[PDB]
Design a protein around this ligand. Structure first.
Ligand SMILES: Cc1cc2nc3c(=O)[nH]c(=O)nc-3n(C[C@H](O)[C@H](O)[C@H](O)COP(=O)(O)OP(=O)(O)OC[C@H]3O[C@@H](n4cnc5c(N)ncnc54)[C@H](O)[C@@H]3O)c2cc1C
Ligand SMILES: Cc1cc2nc3c(=O)[nH]c(=O)nc-3n(C[C@H](O)[C@H](O)[C@H](O)COP(=O)(O)OP(=O)(O)OC[C@H]3O[C@@H](n4cnc5c(N)ncnc54)[C@H](O)[C@@H]3O)c2cc1C
Lengths: 447, 447
C-alpha cells in the first residue's frame, strides 16, 4: 500500500505513539535535520497522571488531552499521523498502520517505539467485560459513567440487597492509580454527592481497595505505604490486602485471601488497575529480532534502548524493560529524549564511535491519596500530608499545556478542594456502556 | 411493577424531562405543598443553545450540562430520577420508565410533560446513519469526532478525489443550528487548524449549507436572513438554498433543487439540523386522548397547556404546539413556569374558578453566525454584526449555572475569539462511531 505520508530525501524518523516518550522525541528533533512521522492511535497527548480527575468529574478532557497536531504546529519537521500501528517490519523497515479501514505502510530510516503499556488481568482477560481498566479517556469517561450511574440506579432500587450491591465500589490494585481512585470515589460519595439523594444516603457507600500485594504503594516503601493506608482507612476506604482476585462477575468479585480462605464481595461498579502489560507490538519485535521479553512482555532493550541487531530501532517508556528504570512519566520522557538525541547526534556530521548507555536520573516519585494528603519520596527525604499534596499539584500543573489550560485547571482545583462542587459530572449511557455493548454484539456476530 | 421513587401522602407531581420546561417547573414548585418526581433520560440539564460550542471544541460538557440532581440539591421536596419514560398511562395515572432493564411505574396526581423535540429526517430516517443530528452531548461529541476525523483522514489519503470528498463538510438546514455549525466549521478549518497540517491545507476545505427554504433563518425575516447569508458567504460557506435532499450516503448527498435539476454533493461529514419531530410520547397521548398532533407530532394542547379531558396533565416546551409560540428556550421556560404556577395555585386552595390562558411574553430572538457577527431581533428593532454578537454572548452566559462555569466559559471565549486556539479538540473513535457501529451490529443481530 501507499505510505500514507509525505516523503523526503533526508533521513526519515518514524515515532510510534503520542505519549511522553514519542512526543518528547518529536520535540527533541525540532531542528535535527530529519523528516519525522509521528504515528499515534489517537490525536491527543494524554497527560495520564491527571486522568483520575477526569474519571471523577474534576476536570475536562481538554485540560489533559491537547491535540498533538496542535502542539507540533510550528515544527515543520514533524507530520502527525493518526493510525493504529498493526505491524512493524524490521527487514523492509516499514511501519504498517490502519485508519478507519485504510492501510498504510510508512517507511523509516530510524524508528522510536513509544507505544507504552496497559494494565493487565493476568490472563483472565474476560474480566475486562466487568472491571474496566482506566488507561484512556474512553476508559476515564466509562468509569465516570459507571460510578455516577451506580448511585443513579441505587436511588430507584427498592430492594435493599441490590442497593447494597450497587453502593459497594471495588477498586483492584493498590498502586498509585488505585489509591487515587479509591480516594476520589470516597470523597465523591461522602462529600460531593452529600445531600443530593432522597432515597439512598451516599455516605453509606462502601469503597473497597483490593490488592494481592502485602502493602499499599509498594514503590514508596513501607513507611509511606502505611501512611497512605492510614489516610485511606481514615476516609473509610476498606483496604483489603493479600487478597487475590479469582473471579469476576457483573455482580461482584470472588477473592482468595493469603490464608487460603475464599470469599465474595458483591459490587456493581468495579475498577481494575493491577499489573502491567506492554503493548502487543512487543511480540512482533520479539519474533523478528529475537529480543526477549519480560513477564508483562516489555522489551528488554539493549543498554542504548535499541533492539539487538537493529541499532536504529529504539523502544522507550513503559514498553521498555530498562533495568532499574521505573514505569513513570520521567522514564518515558528521559528515554525518548535519549533516543532522539542519539538520532540527532548521528545524523549530524558528528559520530561517537560508541554510544554512551542510557542513564536514568531519578527525580523522585509522588502519589496523591486525598484532598490535602499525598505521599512523596525524593532521595533520602520522605514526606507526606498537606505539603506533599501541594508539591504534587504544582509538579503536575507544570506539565499541562498552555497557560489558559493551567488557569482553568487551577480554578477547577480551587472549587473542588475549597468547596466540594465538581464541574464535570456529565455522564451518558453511551459513554458508560458502548464498549460492553459492542463487544457483546461482536461476540454474537462472530457466530 | 413497583414505583421507582419514595412514597408521599401529599399531592404528587411528576415532571418528565430535565430540560428548560421540566427543570423550570421543578424550581417553581420549591415552596409548594407538593411532592415532585423529576424523571429524565439523562442526569444533566443540557443548555442546548451552546451545544455547538461543544461540537466544535470551544467548551467542555460540564460547562453546559450541570447535573440536575445537583441543581435541585437544596430542594427537599424534589426527587430527581434517571429513566427513559417508555409509557404514560392517563387512566391509571402512572408513568412507566426503564433504567438499565429495570422497569418502574411512578404514580402521579399532576403530570408535566417536557420531553421536547428532536430534529427530523422527514420520511427518510435511515439518513440518521450518515447525517448525525446534533441534539445531545452524545451528538455534540460525535460531530466533533467526525469533523476533526475528516481532516485526520484527509491528511493521509493519497487520492485527491477522496481528499475532496473528505474536506467537503455538508450542513443540512439553515435554521439557527445550521448557521451556527456552518460558521464554526468554517472558522475551524480556516483559523484553528491553519498550519497544523502538512499534506492538506485545511483552508481549501468546502463548507456547504443546504436548505429547501428560500432564505436563511426564515424566523428572522429577509433583512437579517440576508445579512447572515452575506456573512456566511464572506466566510466562504457555499450557501445552497432551494435544495431538497433526496438521498444520503456514506459518500455524500444527492439533492433535487427548485430548478428541478439533480446534483450530487460528494461529502464525507454531514450534519443534519432540518425540521422538527416531537418526542414519540405524543403518540401515546394521542391514542389515550382526543388530542391532535402537528405534522411534527407536537401536541396541540388546550389554551391552558392541558390535554383535553385531563385538566392535570400539561405539555410544555418544544413538545407543545401552542399557537403563536416559537420553539425556543423562553417558550419552554414560560410554559413550565405557567404549568407549575397553576399546580401551586390549585393545590394551596387558591384556585380560580377558571384558569387564565397561557400568554407567551415574546422577549425577542437572536442567532449567532460567526466570531464577531450575529443577528438579533427585539420587536421593532433589528440589528446585526458585532454588537448583536456581544449581546448574544452576554445573554447566553447569564443562563449558565455556577459562577466558575461562567468564568471558565468566558475564558474559553476569550481565548477562542481573541486567539484562535480551542481547548477541547479531544476526540475519540468510540465517541465518533459507537452509535452507528452499535446500530449496524444490532441490525446484524436482528437476523
Ligand atoms: C491513571 C494513571 C496515573 C498515572 N500517574 C502517574 C503519576 O502520578 N506519576 C508518574 O510518574 N506516572 C504516572 N503514571 C504513569 C505514566 O502515565 C506512564 O509512565 C507514561 O504515560 C508512559 O508513557 P509512554 O510514552 O511510555 O506511553 P503512553 O504515553 O502511556 O502511551 C503511548 C502512546 O502510544 C499510543 N499507542 C499505543 N499503542 C499504539 C499502537 N499500536 N499504534 C499506535 N499508537 C499506539 C497510545 O495511544 C499513546 O498515545 C500514571 C499512569 C496512569 C494510567
Ligand atoms: C443546536 C441547538 C441550538 C439552539 N439554539 C437556541 C437558541 O438560539 N435560542 C433558544 O431559545 N433555544 C435554542 N435551542 C433550544 C431549543 O430550540 C428549544 O427551544 C429548547 O431546547 C426547548 O427545551 P425543552 O423545555 O423542550 O427541553 P429540551 O431541551 O427539549 O429537553 C428535553 C428533556 O427531556 C428529556 N426526555 C426526552 N424524551 C424523554 C423520554 N422519553 N423520557 C424521559 N426523558 C425524556 C431529555 O433527556 C431532556 O432532558 C437550541 C437547541 C439546539 C439543539
Amino acid at each position: 500500500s501507499h505510505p500514507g505520508a509525505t516523503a523526503s530525501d533526508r533521513h526519515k524518523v518514524v515515532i510510534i505513539g503520542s505519549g511522553f516518550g514519542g512526543l518528547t522525541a518529536a520535540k527533541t528533533l525540532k531542528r535535527a535535520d530529519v523528516d519525522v512521522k509521528l504515528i499515534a492511535r489517537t490525536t491527543h497527548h494524554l497527560f495520564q497522571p491527571l486522568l483520575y480527575q477526569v474519571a471523577t468529574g474534576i476536570i475536562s478532557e481538554g485540560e489533559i488531552a491537547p491535540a498533538t497536531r496542535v502542539i507540533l504546529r510550528k515544527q515543520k519537521n514533524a507530520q502527525v499521523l493518526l493510525g493504529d500501528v498493526t505491524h512493524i517490519d524490521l527487514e523492509n523497515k516499514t511501519v504498517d498502520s490502519v485508519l478507519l479501514g485504510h492501510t498504510y505502510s510508512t517507511p523509516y530510516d530510524s524508528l522510536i517505539i513509544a507505544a507504552g503499556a496497559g494494565q493487565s488481568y493476568f490472563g483472565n482477560d474476560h474480566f475486562a467485560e466487568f472491571a474496566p481498566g482506566m488507561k484512556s479517556i474512553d476508559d476515564a469517561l466509562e468509569l465516570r459513567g459507571r460510578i455516577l450511574g451506580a448511585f443513579e440506579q441505587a436511588e430507584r432500587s427498592s430492594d435493599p440487597v441490590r442497593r447494597a450491591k450497587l453502593l459497594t465500589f471495588t477498586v483492584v490494585g493498590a498502586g498509585p492509580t488505585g489509591v487515587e481512585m479509591a480516594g476520589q470515589i470516597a470523597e465523591l460519595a461522602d462529600q460531593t454527592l452529600r445531600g443530593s439523594f432522597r432515597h439512598i444516603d451516599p455516605t453509606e457507600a462502601r469503597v473497597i481497595l483490593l490488592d494481592a500485594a502485602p502493602a499499599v504503594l509498594p514503590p514508596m516503601g513501607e513507611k509511606l505505604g502505611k501512611k497512605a493506608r492510614a489516610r485511606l482507612e481514615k476516609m473509610g476506604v476498606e483496604v483489603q490486602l493479600g487478597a487475590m482476585v479469582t473471579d469476576v462477575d457483573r455482580n461482584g468479585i470472588t477473592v482468595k485471601d493469603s490464608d487460603g480462605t475464599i470469599r465474595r464481595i458483591e459490587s456493581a461498579c468495579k475498577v481494575w488497575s493491577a499489573g502491567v502489560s506492554a503493548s502487543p507490538l512487543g511480540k512482533d519485535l520479539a519474533e523478528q529480532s529475537g529480543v526477549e521479553l519480560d513477564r508483562a512482555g516489555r522489551v528488554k532493550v539493549q543498554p542504548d534502548l535499541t533492539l539487538p541487531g537493529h541499532p536504529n530501532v529504539f523502544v522507550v517508556g513503559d514498553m521498555a524493560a530498562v533495568e532499574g528504570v521505573p514505569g513513570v512519566a520521567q522514564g518515558a520522557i528521559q528515554g525518548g529524549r535519549y533516543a532522539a538525541k542519539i538520532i540527532k547526534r548521528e545524523v549530524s556530521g558528528t559520530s561517537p564511535k560508541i554510544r554512551t548507555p542510557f542513564e536514568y536520573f531519578d527525580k523522585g516519585s509522588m502519589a496523591t491519596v486525598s484532598r490535602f494528603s499525598a505521599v512523596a519520596k525524593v532521595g533520602p527525604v520522605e514526606f507526606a500530608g498537606f505539603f506533599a499534596w501541594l508539591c504534587w499539584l504544582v509538579l503536575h500543573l507544570v506539565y499541562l499545556v498552555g497557560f489558559k489550560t493551567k488557569i482553568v485547571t487551577l480554578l477547577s482545583w480551587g472549587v473542588t478542594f475549597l468547596s466540594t462542587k465538581r464541574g464535570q459530572l456529565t455522564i451518558t449511557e453511551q459513554q458508560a456502556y458502548a464498549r460492553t455493548r459492542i463487544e457483546e454484539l461482536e461476540e454474537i456476530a462472530a457466530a
